[PDB]
Amino acid sequence: TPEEKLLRAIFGEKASDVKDSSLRVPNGVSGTVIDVQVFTRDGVEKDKRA
Amino acid sequence: LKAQTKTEEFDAIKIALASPDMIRSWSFGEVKKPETINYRTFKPERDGLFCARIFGPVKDYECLCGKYKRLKHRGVICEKCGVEVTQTKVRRERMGHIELASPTAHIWFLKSLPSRIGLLLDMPLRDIERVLYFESYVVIEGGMTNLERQQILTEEQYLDALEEFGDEFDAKMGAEAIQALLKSMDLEQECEQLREELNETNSETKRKKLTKRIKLLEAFVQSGNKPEWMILTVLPVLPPDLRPLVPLDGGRFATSDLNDLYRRVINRNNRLKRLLDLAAPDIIVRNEKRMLQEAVDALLDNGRRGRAITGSNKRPLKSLADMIKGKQGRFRQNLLGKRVDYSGRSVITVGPYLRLHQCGLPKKMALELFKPFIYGKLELRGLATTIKAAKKMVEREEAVVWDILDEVIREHPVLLNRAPTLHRLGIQAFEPVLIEGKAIQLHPLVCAAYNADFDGDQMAVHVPLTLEAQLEARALMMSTNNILSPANGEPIIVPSQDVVLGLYYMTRDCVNAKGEGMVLTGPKEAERLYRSGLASLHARVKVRITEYEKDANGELVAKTSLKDTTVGRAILWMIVPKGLPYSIVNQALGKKAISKMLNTCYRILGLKPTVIFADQIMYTGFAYAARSGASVGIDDMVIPEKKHEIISEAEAEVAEIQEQFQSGLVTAGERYNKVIDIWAAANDRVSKAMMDNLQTETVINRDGQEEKQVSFNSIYMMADSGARGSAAQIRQLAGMRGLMAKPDGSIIETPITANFREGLNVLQYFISTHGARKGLADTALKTANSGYLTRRLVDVAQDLVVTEDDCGTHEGIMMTPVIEGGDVKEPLRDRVLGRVTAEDVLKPGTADILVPRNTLLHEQWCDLLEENSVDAVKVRSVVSCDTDFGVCAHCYGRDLARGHIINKGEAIGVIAAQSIGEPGTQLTTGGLPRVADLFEARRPKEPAILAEISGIVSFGKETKGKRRLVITPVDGSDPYEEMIPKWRQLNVFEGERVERGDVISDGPEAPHDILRLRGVHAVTRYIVNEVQDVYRLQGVKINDKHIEVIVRQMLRKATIVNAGSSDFLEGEQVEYSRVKIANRELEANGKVGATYSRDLLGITKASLATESFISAASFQETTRVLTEAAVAGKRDELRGLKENVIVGRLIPAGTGYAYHQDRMRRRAAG
Amino acid sequence: GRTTDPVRMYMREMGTVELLTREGEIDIAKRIEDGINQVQCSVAEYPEAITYLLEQYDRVEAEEARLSDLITGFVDDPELAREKFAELRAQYVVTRDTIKATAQEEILKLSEVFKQFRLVPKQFDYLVNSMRVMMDRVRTQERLIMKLCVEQCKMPKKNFITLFTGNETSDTWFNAAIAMNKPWSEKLHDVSEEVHRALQKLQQIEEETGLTIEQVKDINRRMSIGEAKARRAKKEMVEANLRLVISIAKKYTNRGLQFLDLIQEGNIGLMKAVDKFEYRRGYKFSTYATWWIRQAITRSIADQARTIRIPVHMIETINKLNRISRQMLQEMGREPTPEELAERMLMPEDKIRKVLKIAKEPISMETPIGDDEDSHLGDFIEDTTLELPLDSATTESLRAATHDVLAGLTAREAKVLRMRFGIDMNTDYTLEEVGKQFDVTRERIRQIEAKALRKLRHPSRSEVLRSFLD
Ligand SMILES: [Mg+2]
Ligand SMILES: [Zn+2]
Ligand SMILES: [Zn+2]
């Protein structure tokens, strides 16, 4: 909208074409990570970590 | 002043049939295609169930084609595809329509039990359906030839009749036929003719139906509805977002079933149109018409014909009627419940440190709950630049926010609620106290009102957002403002268990203990003596005390003396405020006395002192109980030494009777009864052994050899004080427990000879199991029964609210003590307390008025009545109140959580229903089902009969199945002769005179009778006394008031006898009627006034009639109510609670009563 | 009795109709032939029907139309068409001048050549419609002239039809019959002005249509008769053949359409089958109609049976995938990989994912989940199109923010910045527009903007607006 456009104009920020869907630990629960698994479609290139 | 056009704040509501043009008014376009979305670009296909042109833009302020995307362009209809760019919200609003080829019946008016199309046309249902399916021809406007107007013909018959008469005769078939019938119908002419026919012939059969039908007809005329509208020309389509196509995860879609239905109706409809333009044979187009009828029926209300199933899924698709009805019995989404913001819940804990006016609230909970307040307060003081920054602050949980939360919490109450809300105390307001940890802390004294154990029960919290809610919570729902049950004036704040064991152990006395006999200046040095270990907590001691009595005029007198008391009572006295006498703490202080302490304190010093007193009592109770070191060991349970001997003798008895059965001296059944009797007697013996031993066996020494007092044994103190445990359970612990019963209801003749202190073997335990399971099952069921009962009750009362101040009638019921068969099963003082006198009452001598006409009788007035011997007081009741459409506060009583007279505008029906309903769990023909039977007015199974009229009676005729009874009044005419079946043993004396309402036989009697023969006061007395018998037998305290309001709601309707304005036999409101004959007695006709006869309707029956249809649609059967109202064009004015709750505005009671009143008088006025 | 369930009140209603004998089929078809040919011949006897075809072909060669919009072809290409139309025009230009007894022999032939033309159904329809509308036009004057005498001026209809039949145009009946001194004679004078002026269109019809009011009724009456005969026979045939439709639709049951829907669409198919059938080819009507009915069924199911409509080739594609998945299910012993059926199929083969996804049917929003309780799937679908209050508050706040900071610059910098963006104003303005509104134009304005942005950049100003960007 107009004032957001003015805001971006002054502060020169590129508002991303991407939104953050990242999985974050649910509120209030705290613990230590004991494992991670990565399932991939057969034929898609496995990423670095996986 | 120009009235208005656009939105005002509306009053009432109207419902009626819909014209084709009226249906077109709502419609913003015709949906011409079954298509939903394009299948790739998911945009709506134009002219389909989902359409941007007809309904609205897919996204906010944006055209479908995308040409006008700017928020500036608004009222613009796009030149490409007309879509007015406006918020997508309007896709939740805008309706549509479909123009049907052939006419179609509306299933609601075809299949409603009294079929509307049917009885409007005076035509049977099966005929109408037979005509709709093209299974026969029906005549319309037959003219004069051979034939009736509504007559039905077959193929061959229609042909022959057509060959004979070409014109001046008419017949059609299918929907068009029925519509032709309804349109041709002239209601007025029918009215005239039916009035004439009514007048001419005398037969009950004829004129009953005649008058019923004429009434129906003129009603439908006055409605504004024209019959044709029962046949659908145009079919409205529901807005898209109310039946959405919205996407899911995995790219999957999900949609309402209505689409599947609507689509069908469209397809077939369109197909039918095609079949017209292709000139198809009749057999085809007919089938298509029937199919269209079926599709429309399935759309509107599914299940009244075929129950169509949804695509690929067996489960029947949900139709619009099923959308309206909802489910979980009768619940309309206000009724079942609604999710609410600013709320929470969790496991609850104790928190004895709390004052009675507060509660422990978990920090995190209070943080998330008050979040907007916190945001606003953070930038109010300028600790946060903007709202966003405030969010980031509290989300970071910066240290500074906790203090701000301490600010927003202070004066700002929160509502606490428990799971089974029964009476109004199920929700109470508290002051939040910020507490670390995730559990809610709840004041112990309140634990009674919630019926909340600590075993993991959870409670919910609600935040009172608006200012009015803060003040409502603080001045109404506040904890300290309800100290008394609305059911009875007794304190609900009564100390529960630990505390009462504390005060019990505190004031009690043993025979010999440290400090016995000495004397002390005052309670201070008594406590000083105790804590230092010099003097025992319980010892007989004289101490000087100063008590107070306010018995002067509003003024506290003081007096000092040497009281013979104990150390404990002395220490405890420090707590007792002001004008209470020392007499109250000088006793043993059981759970019963400790209650009357608070009660007297309330009726004397007022509210605040009672509150602070109660708090102190709790604190000291816990403290001293903790000091006492009370415990429970295995040796705390003492078995009688004589048990085994009792068992042995009683065991000899059974083998004696057995030996008698072996020799035939006694029959099997008589044997059984005998053995069972001896075992029962044995059980009683052991019980009264262990009771003596456990109770008095402490045998101790003071200065001499011996003496014996009541035991200091733990479990005994527990059971005696009223803390926990009772003689029955104690009896189960030490002495043998009972004789159990096999499932069929018989009782096993070999009881449980062991107990819990000893071991139970295999058999005894297995037999105990049944008793256990039946216990759990029965209680868990009685919960449901109670709930159902409260439901029926609030349904029958509800809208009853205190409206006027004083109706000013001398009328009332005579209040006497209940005096049952023994001495006084309940006194006069309890029955008349807090009520108001109907007229001034005498001393034994007169021209001396103790209580002057109508005055609230409080404790002092009742005690003044008690000083004198007065045995009888006439008292105003809610049943006799002259006020119409409510109760005057003057007729109700004072009763509330406060001792003052009932406020103007409090809704009494609801609290009455709740007051009757809450204790219902504790109830066990007799019992809770007996109560339900009572309030339902149900005629018993084998009832008695009361004399129809006074005077000498005799027996007449002979045995036909009835031997007639002939009554002979002294002066008046004889002709009353009642047919009494003679195989029922009579009572009435063949040679004696019987008053009307005497016993002509035995057995219980239907209260319809009692109302008719004995009278209104008589019947209300019967109901109240019987239901009170049921409750009081269980030890339940319920004031007669609530029951009386329920009764008043039961008798709301009556049936006229005489005439001169309205119809003869009509059941109708006595409010309406009495206000009409009070109006008629003067002016009008000089007096044309009509006599009525009061009627008795059961609660579930009385709840049926409600002026407001929106209210009825809630708890009754929705479909029928909606139809039956829609025909008469009934106009709901609201005015009640349920309806206003549904529509979502202020309740016409309590705080809201000021608004509605101000609105109610503005209405129908200048 | 009638158990309702409209399948039954159909099944029993059609079951009355007796099956056709092999001879009866030929009888009925013959009846059809008779009927239609009557309306065709009746069309051939209309002058306007000819002249119209002429005026249309003159428009075809003038490039105002195409040969496809007039003829579907004759009994029997553009050249052959040109010369056939030349034949038509020829017989027309002879028959026209011979109207002076002998003419009939050619007027009979004029029909014949016109009968060689097989018209587009639309064109034929336009013709017949025009005829019946012309008959409406005749009826207007007949009923006007009737009511102006009988109802208004009080004349019996018994004597009204005497001088009517055979003429109904000239003044023999109107001006020579009012002097007859009948009780109804002198009464005819009041309305005379209104009758004789309305006689204009009446006598005009015999000019336009080239037929006396006599023939105009006869011709299209015969046409009406023919049409009636036709429809009668065809209907008869369809009603006879419903059983076949029922037998065929029992194959297609669970494809996602109701039984009666199926049999109705199939019935439409059978109607088309009767419409297009020719018994002269010796092809049995049963096996000929089967194809049409099956066609209606399948073609309908493809079109309307989905909550989401999909094109035909897509559907067929999906089915094609299913076929492979069947063999390959046990053949692979597990199931073909998601890309396995892809190589088996012609097209780019990554389309498996898209096609397989879009093919799925939406789940009933009333689908029950858990407890059997009133929780139903739709109750769990949240509104994602809404806007959080925690945001809206910040919108309303940001307004106060930028509005505050816009009071911090010179009124012209404020005007230029409120202009350059949509702030509290409709749309927003191009930097040239801003120049014309300010009278100071081009590069100049942009400069101010920069400095404006510059003043808000270094913080006293910046501290309030900076907290807005997360
Ligand atoms: Mg519990
Ligand atoms: Zn557009
Ligand atoms: Zn009253």
Q: What is the resolution of this structure in A?
A: 3.7
Which ranges constitute the DSSP H helices of C332-359?
Answer: 340-344, 351-358
Strands B813-815 and B963-968: unpaired
Tell me, in angstroms, the distance from the centre of ligand 3 to residue B854's CA.
11
Tally of CB atoms within 10 A around B463: 23
Distance CA B635, CA B633 (A): 5
Nearest ligand to residue B453 Cα? 1
Q: Which residue has the tokens 């092999």?
A: C22
Distance CA B177, CA B173 (A): 5
Q: Which of C387, C407, C439 is where one domain is finished? A: C387
> Comparing C-alpha atoms, which of B817, B828, B812 is closest to residue B881?
B812
How many alpha carbons fall within 13 Å on the CB side of residue C228?
6
From C423, C457, C462, residue closest to A3, measured CB to CB: C423
The tokens for B17 are 């049939």
Q: How far is CA C280 from CA B588, B1131, C26, C33, C285, in A?
A: 120, 71, 9, 11, 11
CB C231 within 8 A of CB C258: no
Q: What length does chain A have?
A: 50
CATH of the domain at B1120: 1.10.150.390
Q: How far is CA B300 from CA B295, B296, B330, in A?
A: 9, 6, 19
Tally of CB atoms within 10 A around B717: 20
CB B220 within 8 A of CB B1127: yes
Question: Does C397 lie at the interface with A, CB-CB under 8 angstroms?
Answer: no
- B546 backbone dihedrals φ, ψ, rounded to 5°: -115, 110
Distance CA B895, CA B836 (A): 11
Chain breaks in chain C (C to N over 2.5 A) after: 76, 100
**Closest Cα in chain A, distance from residue C422 (Å):** 5
B455 annotated as a binding-site residue:
yes
What is the strand order of the sheet B540-549 is part of? B519-520, B540-549, B557-566
For residue B548, the surrounding DSSP H or E stretch is strand B540-549
CB B274 within 8 A of CB B268: no
The dihedral region occupied by C335, where left means phi > 0, alpha psi between -120 and 50, and beta the remainder, is left
Q: With contacts defined as CB-CB under 8 Å, which chain B residues touch C467?
A: 385-386, 388-389
- C294 backbone dihedrals φ, ψ, rounded to 5°: -60, -40
Q: Same domain, yes or no, for C353 and C267?
A: no
DSSP B588-632: ---HHHHHHHHHHHHHHH-HHHHHHHHHHHHHHHHHHHHHHT---
Q: How far is CA C161 from CA C137, C142, C179, C199, in A?
A: 19, 11, 17, 16
For an interface test with B, the pick among C13, C423, C470 (most B C-beta atoms closer than 10 Å) comes out as: C13
Indicate the SS3 state at residue C175. Answer: coil
Distance CA B53, CA B43 (A): 11
Which residues fall inside 5 Å of ion ligand 1, going by CB? B 453, 455, 457
Q: Same domain, yes or no, for C275 and C343?
A: no
The dihedral region occupied by C454, where left means phi > 0, alpha psi between -120 and 50, and beta the remainder, is alpha
C-alpha radius of gyration, chain B, whole number: 38
Q: Which class for B4: exposed (0-12), middle (13-18), buried (19 or more C-beta within 10 A)?
A: exposed
CB B507 within 8 A of CB B568: yes
Write the single-letter amino acid at C204. Q
Q: With contacts defined as CB-CB under 8 Å, which chain A residues touch C452?
A: none
Q: Same domain, yes or no, for C80 and C25?
A: yes
Distance CA B853, CA B845 (A): 17
Tell me the three-class secondary structure of C224-262, residue by residue: HHHHHHHHHHHHHHHHHHHHHHHHHHCCCHHHCCCHHHH
CB B1062 within 8 A of CB B1088: no
Question: Does A31 lie at the interface with C, CB-CB under 8 angstroms?
Answer: no
Structural domain range at position C434: 388-470
Indicate the SS3 state at residue B152. Answer: strand
Q: Which residue has the tokens 């099997």?
A: B668
Residues in Cβ contact with B269 at an 8 Å cutoff, skipping those fewer than 6 apart: B98, B100, B101, B292, B295
Tell me, in angstroms, the distance from the centre of ligand 1 to residue B476's CA.
27
B891 annotated as a binding-site residue:
yes
Residues in Cβ contact with C414 at an 8 Å cutoff, skipping those fewer than 6 apart: C406, C407
The tokens for B1 are 């002043």
DSSP B362-380: EHHHHHHHSHHHHHHHHTT
Cα B1046 from chain centroid? 11
For an interface test with B, the pick among C235, C264, C272 (most B C-beta atoms closer than 10 Å) comes out as: C264
CB B570 within 8 A of CB B543: yes
Q: Which of C371, C387, C403 is where one domain is finished? A: C387
Tell me, in angstroms, the distance from the centre of ligand 3 to residue B826's CA.
26
Q: Same domain, yes or no, for C292 and C431?
A: no
> Comparing C-alpha atoms, which of B691, B688, B635, B698 is closest to residue B509?
B698
Tally of CB atoms within 10 A around B103: 19
C411-432 b/e (C-beta count within 10 Å ≥ 16 → b): eebbbbbbbbbbbeeeebbebe
CB B457 within 8 A of CB B683: no
Distance CA B320, CA C95 (A): 70
Residues in Cβ contact with B244 at an 8 Å cutoff, skipping those fewer than 6 apart: B255, B256, C365
The tokens for B740 are 């159990």
The tokens for B471 are 């003040």
CB C40 within 8 A of CB C234: no
> Comparing C-alpha atoms, which of B546, B580, B548, B539 is closest to residue B563?
B546
Q: Same domain, yes or no, for C201 and C350?
A: no
CATH of the domain at B680: 1.10.132.30
Q: How many CB pairs under 8 A join B and C?
A: 160
Domain count, chain C: 3
Strand ranges, E, within C44-124: 71-74, 117-119
Tell me the three-class secondary structure of C432-454, residue by residue: HHHHHHHCCCCHHHHHHHHHHHH
Q: Same domain, yes or no, for C113 and C48?
A: yes
Q: How far is CA C321 from CA B284, C337, C342, C344, C350, in A?
A: 37, 12, 8, 9, 13
Question: Does C86 lie at the interface with A, CB-CB under 8 angstroms?
Answer: no
Q: How far is CA B398 from CA B374, B377, B438, B824, C344, in A?
A: 13, 15, 19, 68, 63
Determine the residue of chain B that is closest to C462 in CA distance: B385
C-alpha radius of gyration, chain A, whole number: 19
Q: Which of C345, C371, C387 is where one domain is finished? A: C387
> In chain C, what is the greatest distance between 2 CA atoms, to the nearest angstrom?
115
Distance CA C35, CA B967 (A): 91
Contact A3 C338 (CB under 8 A): no
> Comparing C-alpha atoms, which of B73, B368, B23 is closest to residue B229?
B23
Method: X-ray
Contact B280 C267 (CB under 8 A): yes
Q: Same domain, yes or no, for C407 and C366?
A: no
Distance CA C264, CA B285 (A): 9
From B70, B246, B279, residue closest to C231, measured CB to CB: B279
Structural domain range at position B1142: 1099-1165
Q: Same domain, yes or no, for C24 and C141?
A: yes
Q: With contacts defined as CB-CB under 8 Å, which chain C residues touch A42?
A: 337-339
Distance CA B54, CA C452 (A): 47
CATH of the domain at C369: 1.10.10.10
Distance CA C290, CA C244 (A): 7
Distance CA B428, CA B413 (A): 10
Tally of CB atoms within 10 A around B322: 19
Q: Same domain, yes or no, for C284 and C373?
A: no
Indicate the SS3 state at residue B313. Answer: coil
For residue B873, the surrounding DSSP H or E stretch is strand B873-875
Contact C393 B40 (CB under 8 A): no
**Closest Cα in chain C, distance from residue B287 (Å):** 6
Indicate the SS3 state at residue B1071. Answer: helix
How many alpha carbons fall within 13 Å on the CB side of residue B1159?
17
Cα B844 from chain centroid? 45
